[PDB]
């Protein structure tokens, strides 16, 4: 949220002179904070156009994160840890499962507020159980995949 003002007097707005002076402008209007701001803006010179001088070299600098990605893509943790993750998720999945039975049996309702009370639609077992299978699958794949890759290559 940036705006530009040269700032010229009130009369210039009132007459309608101020758009004759601006020519070679597009202009724009936004409202961070209500009618009071709009009025202040109009008195000034309103939003005069901001363009950006940018290109791909500058754009590439901003892109970056970590070259450290080099070590990290290969890294995998201790096997006891692999087991902790798998255990925590299966245990979790048991809790939500009991609601899930109801969900599939019913859910004729399509009205979000009524569904929420009826078949525990809000705190849904479908959303969360799916979300859970998906973390567990991806997590196991990257850890497992790395361990094997490293083995062959280092020796």
């Amino acid at each position: 949220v940036i705006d530009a003002f040269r700032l010229i007097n009130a009369n210039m707005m009132v007459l309608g002179h101020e758009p004759r002076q601006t020519t070679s402008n597009l202009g724009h209007l936004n409202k961070p904070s209500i009618q009071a701001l709009i009025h202040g803006l109009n008195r000034h010179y309103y939003s005069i156009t901001i363009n950006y001088r940018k290109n791909e070299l500058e754009q590439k600098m901003l892109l970056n994160l970590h070259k450290k990605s080099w070590m990290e893509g290969l890294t995998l943790q201790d096997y006891s840890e692999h087991c902790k993750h798998n255990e925590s998720v299966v245990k979790e999945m048991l809790e939500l499962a009991k609601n899930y039975n109801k969900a599939v049996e019913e859910e004729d309702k399509m009205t979000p507020e009524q569904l929420a009370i009826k078949n525990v639609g809000k705190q849904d077992p479908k959303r969360h159980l799916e979300e859970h299978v998906d973390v567990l699958m991806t997590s196991n794949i990257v850890q497992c995949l790395a361990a094997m890759l490293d083995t062959v290559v280092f020796k």
């Binding site: 998906d134 699958m137 991806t138 794949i141 990257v142 497992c144 995949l145 094997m148 890759l149 083995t151 062959v152």
Partner: protein
Amino acid sequence: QYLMEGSYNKVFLAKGNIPAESYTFFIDILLDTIRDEIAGCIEKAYEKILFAEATRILFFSTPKKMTDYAKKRGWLLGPNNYYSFASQQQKPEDSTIPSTELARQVIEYARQLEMIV
């Protein structure tokens, strides 16, 4: 059926030579095929073979035929040999010894599993 079962003793190599119109031609060649089949089954099955043992099972006619068939495969050492036993023992356990065998080539396996879902 008899071939199918493994019931080699029952198999006719004694019949089909008795009608001589055209049935004999097939049965003579078949005798070589069953003979080979026995040599293979015994190779993986049991560690030794005798000469008292061998004549009857392969359906050899002579002891000379025994000497010939066994050495090819690599058996012959005498009435006592050791092929089978050792290999049968070696297969379970690859938890302390590195491996990738089954579930395909692993490297592909993890990547494929993730594409599908």
